Nucleic acid binder design. Structure first.
Ligand SMILES: [Mg+2]
Ligand SMILES: [Mg+2]
Ligand SMILES: [Mg+2]
Ligand SMILES: [Mg+2]
Ligand SMILES: [Mg+2]
Ligand SMILES: [Mg+2]
Ligand SMILES: [Mg+2]
Ligand SMILES: [Mg+2]
Ligand SMILES: [Mg+2]
Ligand SMILES: [Mg+2]
Ligand SMILES: [Mg+2]
Ligand SMILES: [Mg+2]
Ligand SMILES: [Mg+2]
Ligand SMILES: [Mg+2]
Ligand SMILES: [Mg+2]
Ligand SMILES: [Mg+2]
Ligand SMILES: [Mg+2]
Ligand SMILES: [Mg+2]
Ligand SMILES: [Mg+2]
Ligand SMILES: [Mg+2]
Ligand SMILES: [Mg+2]
Ligand SMILES: [Mg+2]
Ligand SMILES: [Mg+2]
Ligand SMILES: [Mg+2]
Ligand SMILES: [Mg+2]
Ligand SMILES: [Mg+2]
Ligand SMILES: [Mg+2]
Ligand SMILES: [Mg+2]
Ligand SMILES: [Mg+2]
Lengths: 88, 271, 67, 70, 129, 104
RNA sequence: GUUUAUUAAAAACACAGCACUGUGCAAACACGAAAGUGGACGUAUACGGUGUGACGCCUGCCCGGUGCCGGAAGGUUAAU
RNA sequence: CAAGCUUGAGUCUCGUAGAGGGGGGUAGAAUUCCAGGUGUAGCGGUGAAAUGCGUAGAGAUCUGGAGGAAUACCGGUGGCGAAGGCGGCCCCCUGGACGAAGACUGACGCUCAGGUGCGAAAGCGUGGGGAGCAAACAGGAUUAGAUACCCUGGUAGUCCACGCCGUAAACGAUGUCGACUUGGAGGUUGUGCCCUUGAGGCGUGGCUUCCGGAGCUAACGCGUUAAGUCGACCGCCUGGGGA
């Protein structure tokens, strides 16, 4: 997973109070950072199906989490997509 | 990278092509080029010695350094090129002082890598140093039989020779054929194996691809005449004699080796 | 359940120690089962790994003879 | 396995010590199971059956004491 | 996942009656309090008291007559997979009148007799006998 | 960074230049910014089993806090060198600075 | 595609694919009384020879006999 | 439809165990061959025999070398993992689970027809490897016959990398989640406090084993990890053959 320093930096830069640690944007940023970091892992060890399922679970949670945010209020979801780089 | 081709036509039905995108596109290094005319299988008498040879496409002999006896100065590889005179690829390596040469491309080496020769070098694919410093069990390539003669052993597309023993003056190594042969310790060999390993995966696809390589078709002996070949003759697809060469030498099983000078070096015959 | 460690609190068996580690191997170089030693499940599990490390480092023999 | 006879030891006790050492080491019991091949399927079957029998015999022995005075 | 608080309450009270529990504590709700009022007005339960500020809990006390439980069968009729709505003249009759069928109507959560007297239907919730 | 523990045996034939090897290794570690905490040679002693037809080797132990790159470089150096027979590397979570049960 | 110019253009040869065998380099082999050359300014993923001939399912049994290889325990055995 | 809330759910901060997965190295036991030395008439095998290996020196013993697979004891109704499955050691990357206390996110929650992915072994293609075991096959043996069980050899296979099928008694013959409903004896792994004089005691969690009360079942049996009473969803069954 992400290192403590990286997680703290992401939480500080994506949280309103820099101490939320669990808000929608913070969770999305953490999941995207983990997925991007594991993208380079799933190129030399393509047979790691015991971690590919975990990555798929993370992707599914992120998608359900983003859909909930979009349904609840489309005012930061559009900004979060542009700021983080997600296709949708 | 082997690429299957679409069956748009006969001849294209069964072709596969080994493609390396890292190969340089354009003219090679002109100063190291030379001339290599097609012999055609004729010796200096006009007689065909090795038949089934002729035609093809024009080639040019590129000077490839098989010795690498420059101790000290480390060089850097710039690009890779396809040598039509061999099955492997040639890396254009330039020294820090202005000097470019062609070296046999190792397996893992790519553009921008650095290689140092001499016997003060470090264990790394591409470096050259005598057997007195190469650790036992290493997979060297381009091995020299005698000091200063040049690399001759395991310099094909994907061949290598593994060291198994070294009792001071002689070092025992297993060649690609599968047999052990003692060599002088002062001989030099490049580290690692040659780069292009998928060469055996290619298939010509059509008869034309063989004429491109420059090999004439081979005619079976049984379809010839008795005067032309021992296997020839008959009122059909008849064959009633042991398979032999056109010059009356047994083909299946007959071991043709009479060199007794180089017999103390061979440890065990290939199996 | 660490019978040999209740009054000591080692909490970590080190392969460097051999004086208090050779008591867990018989004369034939075999580890005495926890059923007999009365060792905790985690302590015996890590002591086995420590003994394996010692055997790799040639601190304890694998067999009695070991020719 | 390695049993060296001490100074001034009778042959009977010297051989008895060797026999006891072999029995404790379990050398004769290892060949009897390594002579043939046992698949993991039947190995786990035997292990489970042995555990169940060992559990049941102990339970029956402990539960049979509080009955049948003599 | 908890998808029917009323069914959970019915299961809890039935299990308490089966296991001879004095009272059954559980998270409460407005509909739970409304159903408990009907259950207490018919003598099926002893009493109940909501306890809590942020997370209210119902603490229903069961009633035991001569050992045997007073309530025989409490069956959830309209479950949140098949809604059942009945008119005023189509209301059920548990044990020909000896049991009740709680019905939530426009005027509140009343019983069969109250609904028939008022002259309006509603949707049933559960049968208590 | 990560804390490592390297214990290596080398041949008795060159048991006089072992301090030179130790000095070179610790110089490389401190150049690669590794905090060496514990280092001690156990001397020459017998082996449990004969290794390479010799029964007495020389033991050296070193607990350091060095980066993975220099740890891999040291492992490759040990593999390349024929003087060192066998080297074991462990990854410890804490920087132990206590004496070995060996040295007493 | 090629094949008997000038009665046979085909089911005849070749073919990519496949199998076996020899070949450690001063390599096997061939032309040469020899030098030397081709193989090849190549190095067992290469070369030569022998079989079948894109591709899908397969190559089942047998060394009695003739070849080939491994062994020199015993018999015979030239020149000397 | 719009506002709220944390009890559902998800996240942070710290530790804990684990044959969880992928990749690379390293060390012995053991089997099989190669070379050498000592050594002579047997070795192997079965209820018994012979095929087989032996005077060309077998088997045995010792030395050195070659190569493959798995890692004796630890090792357990023990652990991990959705399942299949996972067992020397070390390193590199990584998934998952639990607990002490702390704050927010505020229903974001469960299931799932199509769809996708993983998926024992056996099997097929390419390029290698091949020590032992072993289909097919060869010989011996019992038997009326024995195309088998037994014995002597032995190819594919078992091994590696990338590919293809998606089959099992893929079993707990029990689809996922929620809460409710007496107990005893344990196993593993945290955590709080007590004089921790012993694996001393009192509580609280996660996984799992055995017995058993009520209840259920045609019975066996399940029985807080229900096959006890429910709620949400999917799949399947409607006589045996034909299939
Ligand atoms: Mg040819
Ligand atoms: Mg051909
Ligand atoms: Mg013909
Ligand atoms: Mg002619
Ligand atoms: Mg002739
Ligand atoms: Mg003919
Ligand atoms: Mg003819
Ligand atoms: Mg004919
Ligand atoms: Mg004939
Ligand atoms: Mg002839
Ligand atoms: Mg035509
Ligand atoms: Mg014509
Ligand atoms: Mg020549
Ligand atoms: Mg033909
Ligand atoms: Mg064919
Ligand atoms: Mg045939
Ligand atoms: Mg014969
Ligand atoms: Mg002969
Ligand atoms: Mg982890
Ligand atoms: Mg489906
Ligand atoms: Mg398989
Ligand atoms: Mg066999
Ligand atoms: Mg057999
Ligand atoms: Mg295969
Ligand atoms: Mg099925
Ligand atoms: Mg089933
Ligand atoms: Mg699901
Ligand atoms: Mg589990
Ligand atoms: Mg029971």
């Amino acid at each position: 997973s992400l290192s403590t320093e990286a997680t703290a930096k992401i939480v500080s830069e994506f949280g309103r109070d820099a101490n939320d640690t669990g808000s929608t944007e913070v969770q999305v940023a953490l999941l995207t950072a983990q997925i991007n970091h594991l993208q380079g892992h799933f190129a030399e060890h393509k047979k790691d199906h015991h971690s590919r399922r975990g990555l798929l679970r993370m992707v599914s949670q992120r998608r359900k989490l983003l859909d909930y945010l979009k349904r609840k209020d489309v005012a930061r979801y559009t900004q979060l997509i542009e700021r983080l780089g997600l296709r949708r | 990278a082997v690429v299957k081709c679409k069956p748009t036509s006969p001849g294209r039905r069964h072709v596969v092509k080994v493609v390396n995108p890292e190969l340089h596109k354009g003219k090679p290094f002109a100063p190291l080029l030379e001339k290599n005319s097609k012999s055609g299988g004729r010796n200096n008498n006009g007689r065909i010695t090795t038949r089934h040879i002729g035609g093809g496409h024009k080639q040019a002999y590129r000077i490839v350094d098989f010795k690498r006896n420059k101790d000290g100065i480390p060089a850097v590889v710039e690009r890779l090129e396809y040598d039509p005179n061999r099955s492997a690829n040639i890396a254009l390596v330039l020294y820090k002082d202005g000097e470019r040469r062609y070296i046999l491309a190792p397996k893992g080496l790519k553009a921008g890598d650095q290689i140092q020769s001499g016997v003060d070098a470090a264990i790394k694919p591409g470096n050259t140093l005598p057997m007195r410093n190469i650790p036992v069990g290493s997979t060297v390539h381009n091995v020299e039989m005698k000091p200063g003669k040049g690399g001759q052993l395991a310099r094909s597309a994907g061949t290598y020779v593994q060291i198994v023993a070294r009792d001071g003056a002689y070092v025992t190594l297993r060649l690609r054929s599968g047999e052990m042969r003692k060599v002088e310790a002062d001989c030099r060999a490049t580290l690692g194996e040659v780069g292009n390993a998928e060469h055996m995966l290619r298939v010509l696809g059509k008869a034309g691809a063989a004429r491109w390589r420059g090999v004439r078709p081979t005619v079976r002996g049984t379809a010839m005449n008795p005067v032309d070949h021992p296997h020839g003759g008959g009122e059909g697809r008849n064959f009633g004699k042991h398979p032999v060469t056109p010059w009356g030498v047994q083909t299946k099983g007959k071991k043709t080796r009479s060199n007794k000078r180089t017999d103390k070096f061979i440890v065990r015959r290939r199996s | 359940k660490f019978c040999r460690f209740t009054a000591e609190g080692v909490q970590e068996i080190d392969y460097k120690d051999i004086a208090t580690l050779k008591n867990y191997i018989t004369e034939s170089g075999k580890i005495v089962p926890s059923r007999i030693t009365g060792t905790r499940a985690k302590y015996q599990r890590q002591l086995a790994r420590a003994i394996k490390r010692a055997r790799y480092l040639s601190l304890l023999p694998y067999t009695d003879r070991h020719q | 396995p390695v049993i060296k006879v001490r100074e001034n030891e009778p042959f009977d006790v010297a051989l008895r010590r060797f026999k006891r050492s072999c029995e404790k080491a379990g050398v004769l019991a290892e060949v009897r199971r390594r002579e043939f091949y046992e698949k993991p399927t039947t190995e786990r079957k035997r292990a489970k059956a042995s555990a169940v029998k060992r559990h049941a015999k102990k339970l029956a022995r402990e539960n049979a004491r509080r009955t049948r005075l003599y | 996942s908890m998808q029917d608080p009323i069914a959970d309450m019915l299961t809890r009270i039935r299990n308490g009656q089966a296991a001879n529990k004095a009272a059954v504590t559980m998270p409460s709700s407005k509909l739970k309090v409304a159903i408990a009022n009907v259950l207490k007005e018919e003598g099926f339960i002893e009493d109940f008291k909501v306890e809590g500020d942020t997370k209210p809990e119902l603490e229903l006390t069961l009633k035991y007559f001569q050992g045997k439980a007073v309530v025989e069968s409490i069956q959830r009729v309209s479950r949140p997979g098949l809604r059942i709505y009945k008119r005023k003249d189509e209301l059920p009759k548990v044990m020909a009148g000896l049991g009740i069928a709680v019905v939530s109507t426009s005027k509140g959560v009343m019983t069969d007799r109250a609904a028939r007297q008022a002259g309006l239907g509603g949707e049933i919730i559960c049968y208590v006998a | 960074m990560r804390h490592y523990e390297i214990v290596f045996m080398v041949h008795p034939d060159q048991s006089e230049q072992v301090p030179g090897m130790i000095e070179r290794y610790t110089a490389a570690i401190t150049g690669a910014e590794g905090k060496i905490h514990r280092l001690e040679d156990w001397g020459r002693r017998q082996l449990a089993y004969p290794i390479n037809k010799l029964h007495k080797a020389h033991y050296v132990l070193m607990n350091v806090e060095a980066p993975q790159e220099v740890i891999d470089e040291l492992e490759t150096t040990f593999r390349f060198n024929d003087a060192v027979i066998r080297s074991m590397v462990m990854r410890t979570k804490h920087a132990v600075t206590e004496a070995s049960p060996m040295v007493k």
